Each structure stands twice: as C-alpha cells, then as structure tokens.
Amino acid sequence: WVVGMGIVMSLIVLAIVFGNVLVITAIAKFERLQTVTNYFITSLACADLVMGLAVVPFGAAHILMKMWTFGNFWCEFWTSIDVLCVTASIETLCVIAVDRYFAITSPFKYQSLLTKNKARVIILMVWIVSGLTSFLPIQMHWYRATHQEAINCYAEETCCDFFTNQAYAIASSIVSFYVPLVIMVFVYSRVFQEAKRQLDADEIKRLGKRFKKLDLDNSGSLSVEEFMSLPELQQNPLVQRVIDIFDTDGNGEVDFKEFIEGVSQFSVKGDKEQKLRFAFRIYDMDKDGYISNGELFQVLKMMVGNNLKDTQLQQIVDKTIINADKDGDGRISFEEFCAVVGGLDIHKKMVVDVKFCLKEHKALKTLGIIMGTFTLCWLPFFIVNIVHVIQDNLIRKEVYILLNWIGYVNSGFNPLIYCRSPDFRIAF
C-alpha cells in the first residue's frame, strides 16, 4: 500500500542520514581516527549522505505520488545530482584501492610521501572530475532523443522518465561504471596477492613453529597458564597486562592470527608512534581510552609491591594527575600522555629481533567487503541498462526502477561494515 511504501522510504532516508552523520562525527571528533584512509572514508560517507538526503526522498515522492510536480529545472538538477553521487562514490572506491596497494607494496614510501594535504587535493580532484562529468552533459541536453513522447515528457513538467539518446547511455555506463570497476577489481586482487605472499615470507613460519611448540593445550590458542609455563616468564610483574594487550578479541585466548600482530608491534624499524601507543595501553585497564586514578594506582601497586606505603603512592598519583590534566576531565588522554612523556626517548628501549611490519593488514577485509557489496548492489542495474539500450527492451519500465532502488539502498551498508570493526565499534 502507499502508506507502507512511504513509511519504508522515510525509514530508509532516516537510517542513511543518521548512519552517515554518525560516521562523519566519529571520524572527525575523536582525533585518533584521522588516517588518510579515514579521510577517504569521510569523502565516501559525504557522497552517499548527499545522495541519500537529496535524491532518495524525492525519488520516493516521484514513485509515490505518481505525478512529479516539482519542475523541469528541478528535474534536471535532481538527475544530475544522482549521476554525480554514483560516479563520485565509484571513483573514490578505486582511489582507496590504489592507496591501499601503495601502502602495502612499500610502507615507508607511502608513510613519508603522502600527507594530509595530498589527501585533500586528490579527494577534491576526483570529486570535481566526477562532478564535471555529471553536470556538463546533462545541462547541455546531450541525452534527449527524437521519439515524440520523449519530447512530450521533455515539454511536460510532470513527466521525468529518464530517456536516453541511444548514445548517452553507452558513453556514461563506460566512462563511469565499467572502467573504474575493472580497475578497482584487478588492483585490489593484486593487493590480496601481495598480502598473502608477504604473510608467509619465511619469517612468520618460524614464529608459527614456535607458537605451535608453546601451545600445550593443543586447542589452537594460548591461555595465561600456558604463558606461565616458561620458568623465567612467571616472576614478571607485568605479564598479565601484556596478555590483555594481545587479547584484542576479548575471548580470553591468544591465537596465531593476533600473536604475530602483537609481536609485530615491536620491531627494529617499527614506528615510534606504535611503541608509544603500546606503552600507553599498559595503563588502560579497561581499554576505555582514558587513564583513571584507579587504573593508574592499581597498575603501580603491582610494581612497587610494598616498598612504598599505600598513602604515599596515592598522594604522588594524585599530584601527577592534577598536574597532567590539560582539559579538566580528571583522566589523562593519549595527547596529554604524549605531552608528558616524549623526550625520554623510550621507544628505543622496546626492541625485539623480529623484522616484519604487519601494520597494513588490519584494514583489508572490511574494504574488500565494501567493494564487493558495492559491485553486487550496482552491477545488475547497469547490466539491465546495457540490455535495454537496444529497443529490444526484453522487459522494462517496471523492473528498471526496482533495480535503481536496490542501487540506492546500499548506502546504508557501509556504516554496518564499519561498526563491525572493533575501533569503530568502540568509537560509536
């Protein structure tokens, strides 16, 4: 019924807008999820938020009222915004793919050469290229055909059934969703090839052999009692804490997928920021993101044992926190920590003989999921468009809109994939 369809469209628009705004705020506010990849994600979220907010409600009104009483000019504007949003999203996807390829093939070059300004420049460049490709042909009327009822719909304000020029369809599908599609497919296939080859570079295999030698329970995961099997590892005070840094999945067990990621956090050539972050994470007893007074006292109480009175330790902790608060919250963040520490040069004291940087493997499956979802959602419409080019029109006009709506609805799929990620989940 009409009311049900209207309610469905209202819910869809509300969900899209809310999710995209949530993602934008989560990236912008916390100041820790500000990687260049996250800036590209922000551009993509802006693109699909624009398409949601502007296009989806009005196309819903068109399909509901059965008459489009908004105007010929407004029709041109709406269709051009539609084309712009789709093209911009598909181009930023391949930009992300090539970015990740360059980041994996040689981490140092990407780390040094690419900066925030370059990210903004490339984002604006791709956005303006897509925007030109979408505005320019539409407003200049390259797509209106000769069929008389098409001319009537052009003249009549109510009718906006898109009508191709038998040439506009081909040129736009193959300058917007067929070149970038194949590019973002094989580039990211090479990304998986390189990741799979790098994960087994004769070094990780030795770590796997040692892992399987240390795994007494033979269950495929390391528990805490297995780590205190080592006769010179038991007396360590701060062993438990380090386990809780490796145990990023929260299940109570450490397995080979995250053991190497934990060890690779320490390297001869690893980043200074990674080691400083690891040093910070010892004090976060709940991974909440902030160092409380109870955390900063219970961490210190297991190192000093009973060499200082309880009251003396509490007093000095109080004074430290009071002199470290630069925002009045009462709990130290990572920026305040890096203001306090930094200059000690302690990142040079956390070194292990391993030589491999598995940093760009934490954000490969989610991006692949995004690409696969986008292709699965949007390719059927373009294949139906390429069938319908020919006036064979095997069946059309009431299949052709449901596929445009399947294409529209996928913009809500990205925030769910983001919230599947742990850091984004805790961010929201």
Partner: protein, 352 residues
C-alpha cells in the same frame, strides 16, 4: 575506580587569582589554610606578592635596629608544616614579633610555599616581623640544590627569577636591643666595628671571599679555648673559623653581650657556647629551628625568646607532611623505563 584509597585528602585543583588573597592588605588566614591543603596560586598574584615584599625589604636599613621583646628563630629550609608549628608555639605574629636569622629555601619540597607565606606575612606586618639573609639565598646554591627545579615544576621559571631578584635585597646584620648582634654566620677579619657593616651594599650576589661572604659562611671552632682567629675551615672551604679571643675582642671593643647564629644543627635545638667571664652571658649562641633535618637526623628544634632581660628557650617537635617523589618526578617518568625493560624481557624470552 575514581579513588582506590579515599582516607587521604584531595588537593584543591583551582588556583587563586588575586581576588581572595588580597583586599591593599593581603589575607593571611585563608592563605595559610589553602597552602596547608596542598593548594596553589596563580602566577601573576605570586609575582605581585614577591614584588611587594621586595619593595618593602629594599627600604629597610642594612643593619636592622630592633626593639627588645623579640622571638629569634633559626633556619627552616623549606619545612612548611613545621613553620606553622613554630608560629603556634612562639605566639602568632598578631601579638609578638619575630626575627628570622637563617635561610629558608633549599633542601625541602615546600620552599616556594614557605617563602610566599613569609613574604605575605611581612607585607601585612611591616614593623613586627624582621627577616635576615642566609647562605642558601644565592644563584649558585639554589640552582645546585632542589629549589630551581621546584619553581620550574610548580610554577614558571619567571617566578624563580623574581624570587632571586627579591632575595638579593634582604638585610644582613639586625642589631638587637643595643646589646646583641644577630648574624646568620659569624664575624669576619675584615669587619671589626659595627659601622663596617653599615657601608657595603647587599644588593649583589655574595662573592666567594670578602666581608659579606665571611658573614654568611663562617663557622666557629668546636674547641673554644684552643692553643694559639683566622684559621680557614674545611667543612665549607669558603671562609674562616673564629676562636674565643676573636669574639671576646669584638665584644670588648664594641659594647655588646652576645652573637647569635643559625648554621650548626643542634640535637637539642640550641647551644650556648663557653661562658664569657666579663659579664656572664654566653658569647655565642647557636639556634636551629628545623626539626628532623633532612628527615633522618631525628633532632628537635628550638626557639629562643628574649624578654625582661631573660632568654628562655621553647623546645619543639616535628610534624607530618605529604610525600613528593625525589626531584619531583611524575609517575610516568618514574616507572616508564621499568615498564619497557619488563616488556622487552618477557618478549625476548617467550619468542625463544
């Protein structure tokens, strides 16, 4: 949680921006009760206090002339929580007056608070609390010891520079009741008559030698009556000893009765030296009013009190205080190297 042990009080975390400590009489009771509580002050108000104290001190003479009913006191060395006990023992400054002989700053964690309280109290009472100058009030000793770091951590270094520019103007002789002389160290061979300390300017950092450096660094013999003035010392290595004949000749040429000083720590808190045969009062008296010096000596302090031609001595006792880490290290700088060492050891052991 928020606080694992709560029985210990919390330091107030709001500074005072010259609106409550002042009125321009400064408010003293609230300043005591807020500095007693591990509070703090704004930077500009601290500069104002120190500059006003310097302005009052500079106009003072170079050889203070004091009236009789005084309560002489020794060197404190930053022990704030014992400075209040001193004030409740010897009577609050409202009714009785004080003459602080020795230094205040180095070798203690609450020295900036102590000097702030003393100079506010001097601002409010300008003719009933006299301050003198000690050896620990220079640019060498304080930078060497734990005062420069103290100002750098608690406040800005500009406070430290103002504090030195204001210590550089204290008086140094403080004659008392036309009978005594009250110097921080002792005599000097280049100083023979009282007028000789009415001439030299005190507005410069003490040199390593001369009349001023030998009045703030000197030290008397431990064997008065030694076989035969100007023998050098080894404990300081910077000025001269002086035996009983020197003090006796100084008190015979100039009609006085005794000299007071505040270097040598006394387990009883005071010491009256060999009796002068001319009159009957001891020629040299040593005061010391810092209980538990360096927190280890386990002595007890003392406070002389002069009244009705009688010197009666009030004994003293220690008092508890909060705890600061050595050299004012926060816990992150305190324990980070240990964290790194333990993490590295565990990982280099688990891998093989």
């Amino acid at each position: 949680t928020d606080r694992v042990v709560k029985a210990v009080p919390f330091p107030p975390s709001h500074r005072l921006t010259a609106k409550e400590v002042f009125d321009g009489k400064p408010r003293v009771d609230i300043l005591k009760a807020h500095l007693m509580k591990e509070g703090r002050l704004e930077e500009s108000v601290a500069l104002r206090i120190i500059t006003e104290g310097a302005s009052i001190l500079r106009q003072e003479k170079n050889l203070l002339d004091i009236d009789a009913p005084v309560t002489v006191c020794g060197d404190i060395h930053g022990q704030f929580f014992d400075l209040m006990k001193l004030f409740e023992v010897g009577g609050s400054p409202a009714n009785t007056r004080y003459l602080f002989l020795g230094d205040y700053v180095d070798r203690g964690y609450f020295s900036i608070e102590c000097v702030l309280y003393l100079w506010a109290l001097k601002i409010l009472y300008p003719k009933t609390l006299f301050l003198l100058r000690g050896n620990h009030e220079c640019r060498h000793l304080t930078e060497y010891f734990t005062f420069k770091q103290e100002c750098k951590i608690k406040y800005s270094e500009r406070v430290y520079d103002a504090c030195m520019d204001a210590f550089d103007c204290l008086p140094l002789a403080a004659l008392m009741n036309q009978q005594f002389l009250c110097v921080h160290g002792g005599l000097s061979p280049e100083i023979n008559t009282l007028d000789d300390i009415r001439k030299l300017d005190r507005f410069k950092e003490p040199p390593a030698y001369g009349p001023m450096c030998d009045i703030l660094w000197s030290d008397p013999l431990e064997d008065f009556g030694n076989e035969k003035h100007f023998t050098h010392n080894t404990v300081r290595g910077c000025s001269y000893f002086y035996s009983y004949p020197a003090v006796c000749d100084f008190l015979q040429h100039n009609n006085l009765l005794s000299i007071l000083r505040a270097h040598e720590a006394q387990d009883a808190g005071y010491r009256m030296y060999r009796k002068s045969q001319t009159t009957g009062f001891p020629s040299l008296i040593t005061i010391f009013s810092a209980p538990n010096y360096l927190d280890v000596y386990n002595n007890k302090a003392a406070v002389l009190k002069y009244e009705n031609n009688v010197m009666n001595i009030r004994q003293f006792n220690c008092s508890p205080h909060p705890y600061w880490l050595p050299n004012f290290m926060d816990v992150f700088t305190w324990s980070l190297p240990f964290v790194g060492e333990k993490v590295t050891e565990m990982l280099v052991n688990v891998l093989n």
